[PDB]
Design a protein around this ligand. Structure first.
Ligand code: FE
Ligand code: FE
Ligand code: FE
Ligand code: FE
Ligand code: FE
Ligand code: FE
Ligand code: FE
Lengths: 167, 167, 167, 167, 167, 167, 167
C-alpha cells in the first residue's frame, strides 16, 4: 500500500511542513520585536496553516495504513535584515516547499503510486496560493522601499489575518 | 525588566512547552497506529494545549520588552511498549514540566522579579490539572490491565476530547 | 471520443461496481443470519454506495457519448468463517477495486485520454477512504479475537450507518 | 417454520426482483442512449422500486428464520426495436412477475403456510398497480405512433418520476 | 515559474476562451434574428461562461507572476444554415477547445510544470460538461428534424438559462 | 425600420463598445502586473460596464427588427508609461466614444429617425458620467505625481468597485 | 403655451389612441369568436394600454392649459382573414401610430414648442416597445403557418397577459 521509499518521503515532508510552521513562528517573533503586530499575527496564522499541512500528511499516511514518525525540528533563523528580507526568505522558503512537493509527485509517478499522487494534487494547487500570497506582500514591501508610512499601513492590512489557536 | 538569566530561563521553558506539544503528537501517532482513535485525538488536543502554553510565554516575554529566541525541538520517542507505558511516560513528563516551573518560580523569587513570578502562578495551577488528568487516565489503564474490552471503552470515553485546529 | 478500449474498460468497471454492491449485499445476508444487525445494515449502506459508484461510471459514459452495456452479475459467496473473515474478504475486495481503477488510469494514460484519466481521480481518492473505512473495522475485529462482548459493542457502533433507500 | 421448498421459492422470487431491477436499469441505458432522459429516469425509479421489492422478501425470509441465498443475476437485453417495444417488453415482464407471485401464493396455500400467504398479499396488490402503470405508458406510446412531438411530451411527463438514490 | 513557452500557451488559451465567448454571442445574435429567444438567451449565458474561463486563465497567469497579453479577437461567423447547424458548429468548437486544453496539458507535462498541469485539470473536467451540454441539445435538434412544433418547445426549455449580466 | 446606414452605424457603435471593454480589460492586466489590485478591479468593472453598453445596442437593434453583426476586436495596447498615462488614455478613449455617440445622434436626426435618436439620449447622459468619473481619478493621479503613499491610498479606494461577473 | 395648431394636433392624437383601443377591442372580439381566449385577452389588455395612452395626452393637454375635445371614434373592421392577418394589421396600425407621433414631434420642433416635443419623447420610446411586441408575435404566427398545434400553444402563452379592468 505504501512502499518504504514513499512512506519515508511522506514522513520527510510531514517534517518539512512542521519546520515551515516553526520558521514562520520564528518570523512572528522577529516581527513582534520590531513592534509590527500585524506582520506577526499574519506569520502566526501562516504557522498554523503549516501545522494543518502536516496534519494532512499525518492523516494520509494513516489512511494508507502506514506509520507516522517524527524527526527533530531544526532551530530556525532568529533574525533578518528588514521586513522585506524576511519576506524574501519566506518566498525562498515557499519555493523550496513547492520543489519538494514536485519531487514527491515525480516519485509517486515513477513508482506508479496513483493514490499518493492524487493526494499530492491538493498541495500542488495550495502551493500556488501560498507563493502568490507571499509574493503579493514581498512586492508591496519593495514598493514601500523607504517609507515607514506604507510599512505602517501594510502592518495594518496584514492584521486582518489572525491565528485561530488563541480561541 | 528581564535579566539575561530570566530571559534565558523563559525562552528555555517556551521550548520545553513546544517539545511537550511535540511529544504528545508523537504519542498521538503511536495510539493512531494501534487504531486507538480516541486516545489519538486526546493526545492531539493535549498537543494543542501545549502550543497554548508556549504562546503565553511568548506573550509574557514581549510584554516585558524581551526577545523570543527559538531553539531546535529534539526528536521524541517513536514508541512505547503499551498504552499504559505511554501514559506513564506522559505522567513522568508532566512532573518534569512542573519541576521546571518550580525552578523558574524559585528563580523569579530570588531575583525579586514579582512580575515573572506572578506570570508563573498560572502554570503552577495549570500543572495541577495537567498531572491530575494524566493520572486519572493512567490509573484507568492499570484497572484495564488484561481487558481489551475496557481499553475499547476508555478509547471511546477519550474521543470526547477533540483537537480544535483541524476545523 | 471514447475509444473502443476505453468504452470496454468503463463498462467493465461499471459492472465491477455493481458486483461489489451485490457482494456487500451478500455479506449483509450473512451478518443478518448471525443476528448481527448492525453489521448487516452497515453492509447494505455499503451496497447502496457501490450502486452510486456504478451510476457515476454510467453518467461519464453517456457524457462521453458512449453506450452503457450491462453484463451478468455473478453469484457472490454465501458464507464466511466469521465476521473477522468477512471483513478480510471485504478489504481484499476493495484492494481489488482500487487496482481495477489504477488499471483504468493506466489505460487512460496509454491512450492519452485526459478526460477519462481526470474523471478517475475521484475514484482514486474515494478508494483511499473506502479502504481506510473497511480497514478500521477489520482491525477492531482482530482486537476482539475471542470476546463476544466487543463484537456485540461493534455491532451497535456500525448500526449508526444505515441504508438510505428503504425510506 | 419455512419449508425447504418455500424458502427456495422465496429466495427465487427475491432473485426475480433483482433481475427486474437490472432489466429496468437496462431499459434506462437504452432510453438514455436515445436521449430520452425522462424515460431514462422513470426506468431508474422503477429499478429502485424493484430493489425495494427484493428487500421485502429479504426481510420476510429472516423473520421466518430462513436464510437468504443470492443467485447470479443474468445479463438483460441491451437493445429494443423502439420505445414502444421496450414498454411491451416491460408489460410482458410485469405479467411474468405477477404469475410468479400467484405461483407462490398457490404454493403457500397448498402447504397451508398462512404467514407466507399473508405476506404475499402485498405483492398481489402491488402488481396490479405496476401492470396498470406500465400499461398506461405502453398505450400512450401506441397512441403516439409516428409522432416525435408526442414522444417528446411523454418524455417530459415521465421526468416527474425521479429515482431517489443519486441524492 | 512560467517558461516563456508556457506563458505564450496560456495567453493563447486565454484568447481562445474569449473568442469562444464571442462565438456564442454571434450565435445568440443568429438565434435572436430567428426569433428564438430561448436559444439566444442560452447562448448569451454560454458566452458569459467563457468570459469566466478567460478570467481563470488571467488569474492563474498572475498567480504565477506572469503577464497577460491580449490578442485580437477574430470576427466570428455571422450565420448558420439552421439551428442544428449552429449546434454542430458549437459542438465542433467545443471539440476544438478540448484539443487545445489537452495540448496544454501535454505541454505542461513535457515541461514538468506541475502547477500549470494542476491548474488545467479543472478545464479538462469542465470540457466534459461543456461538450455533453452542447451534444445534448444538438441531438434534440436532430430529433426535431422537420418539426417547428418541437423547435418551439426546446426554445422554451432553453429559456430557463439566462445570462447573469443584464441584471 | 432601420435604414442600412443606421443599422451599419449601430453595429459599428456596438463594436466600439466591445473594444472599449477589451481596452479596459487591457488596462486591468497592466495594473494587475504593477500589483495594483484596486485599479485592476476597477478596470474589470469598467469592462463589464461596456459589455452592458454593447448589450443595449444589441437590444435596440433587434427591437427595430435589425440584425446584429459582430466584427473583429482589434488587439488593444499592452503597456502604458504609468497609471497616470493609462487613465489619460482612458479619458481620451472616453472622449472618443462621446464624439461617436454625437455623430450617431447627428446621423439619427438628419435621417429623421426619431426612435434611434431617442434611444441615444441614454448614451449622451451616460457618457457625461463616464467622462466625469475617469477625470476624477485622472486628477487624483496628477495630485499624486511622486507619492506612492497616495497611489496606495488611491488603489484602496478604487478597490470598492468590483466586477460583478465572477460572482 | 399651446398654439391652436398644436392643441388640435394633440386632441387628434388623443382620438387616435382611443381608436386604437377600439381597434384592438375589435380584434379581441374576432379572436374571441375564433375561440382563441388567449389572443382575445392579450388584445383586451392592449386595448386598455391604448386608453392609457389617450390619458397621457389628456393630462398633458390640461397641464398646458388647454382643452380636450372628444371627436367620434370610427367603426373598426369586424374581421380578418386569419390570426396572422390580424397581426399584420396590428403591425400596420402600430407603424401608422408611430408615424403620427413622428409627425407630432416634427410639428413641435417646427414651432419651437420644447415642452410638447419633450412630452412626446415618452411616446417615441413607447412605440418602439409596441411595434416590437406586435412584431414578436406576428413572426411566430408566420412560423406557425400550417400548424394549429402552435397557434394553440401560442394562444396559451398570450393568456399570460390579462386586462386589469374586469377587477
Ligand atoms: Fe505547507
Ligand atoms: Fe504546558
Ligand atoms: Fe466502488
Ligand atoms: Fe416487483
Ligand atoms: Fe471554455
Ligand atoms: Fe460605453
Ligand atoms: Fe398608443
Amino acid at each position: 500500500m505504501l512502499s518504504e521509499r514513499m512512506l519515508k518521503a511522506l514522513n520527510d515532508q510531514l517534517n518539512r511542513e512542521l519546520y515551515s510552521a516553526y520558521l514562520y513562528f520564528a518570523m512572528a517573533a522577529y516581527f513582534e520585536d520590531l513592534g509590527l503586530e500585524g506582520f506577526a499575527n499574519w506569520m502566526k496564522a501562516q504557522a498554523e496553516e503549516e501545522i494543518g499541512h502536516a496534519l494532512r500528511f499525518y492523516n494520509y499516511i494513516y489512511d494508507r495504513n502506514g506509520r507516522v514518525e517524527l524527526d527533530e525540528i531544526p532551530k530556525p533563523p532568529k533574525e533578518w535584515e528588514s521586513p522585506l528580507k524576511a519576506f524574501e526568505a519566506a518566498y525562498e522558503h515557499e519555493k523550496f516547499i513547492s520543489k519538494s512537493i514536485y519531487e514527491l509527485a515525480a516519485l509517486a509517478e515513477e513508482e506508479k503510486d496513483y493514490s499518493t499522487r492524487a493526494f499530492l494534487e491538493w498541495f500542488i494547487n495550495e502551493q500556488v496560493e501560498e507563493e502568490a500570497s507571499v509574493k503579493k506582500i514581498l512586492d508591496k514591501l519593495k514598493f514601500a522601499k523607504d517609507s515607514p508610512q506604507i510599512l505602517f499601513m501594510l502592518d495594518k492590512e496584514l492584521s486582518a489575518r489572525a491565528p485561530k489557536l488563541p480561541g
